[PDB]
A paper describes a structure:
IAPs regulate cell death survival pathways, inflammation, and immunity. IAP-mediated regulation of NF-κB signaling depends on different protein–protein (PP) complexes stabilized by type-I BIR domains (i.e. BIR1). The cIAPs protein partners for these functions are TRAF1 (TNF receptor associated factor 1) and TRAF2 for the canonical pathway, and TRAF2 and TRAF3 for the non-canonical pathway. Biochemical and crystallographic studies have shown that the TRAF1/2:cIAP1/2 interaction is based on the formation of the cIAP1:cIAP2 heterodimer, stabilized by the interaction of the RING domains, and the TRAF1:(TRAF2)2 heterotrimer.
Residue numbers in the entry: 25 to 98
């Protein structure tokens, strides 16, 4: 249903701290929180991503992994 930068930011309320990637960027790319520790998923393509490194661009990786996503255009 709802898949904006605000609704996707509301799923990052129970997200574990200490993560090396800003929640905004994660939601900006088109991912949200599913509940699993460090577990996001695309809203258009629905790609799951976790265990990120330091300074990793969510958008870049998203297009580098699933470039067929309709929300990966922007
Ligand atoms: Zn996607």
């Amino acid at each position: 249903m709802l898949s904006c930068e605000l609704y996707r930011m509301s799923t990052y309320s129970t997200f574990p701290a200490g993560v090396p990637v800003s929640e905004r960027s994660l939601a900006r790319a088109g991912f949200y929180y599913t509940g699993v520790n460090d577990k996001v998923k695309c809203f258009c393509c629905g790609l799951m991503l976790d265990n990120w490194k330091r300074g990793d661009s969510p958008t870049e990786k998203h297009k580098k992994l699933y470039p067929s996503c309709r929300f990966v255009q922007s």
